[PDB]
Amino acid sequence: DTLDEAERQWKAEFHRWSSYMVHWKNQFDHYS
Amino acid sequence: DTLDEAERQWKAEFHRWSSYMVHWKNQFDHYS
Amino acid sequence: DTLDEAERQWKAEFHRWSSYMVHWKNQFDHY
């Protein structure tokens, strides 16, 4: 369905985003 | 509901994001 | 509707962000 597809693409992009979050948090704490 | 649950994960990441913003603006205003 | 709220809240957070984005950019250029 287009919704299962939407669910898939959202979960994937979320998690990928959450990973830039962790990577950014890391760079941020190190800077300080 | 599978959306509710995802809505929950989002809220969680939303809260952590606001925190990153609070700490980040502070550290920033201090550098200037 | 919860779904409408989330979208609304999400959109509401953009101004501040873009603003920090722009302020950091400037400060970045100078230095």
Binding site: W17 | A6 | L3, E7
Partner: peptide, 15 residues
Amino acid sequence: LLTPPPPPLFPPPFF
């Protein structure tokens, strides 16, 4: 100079 602000906040799930 410190790291730029965290990435743009991710959009709410819709499906």
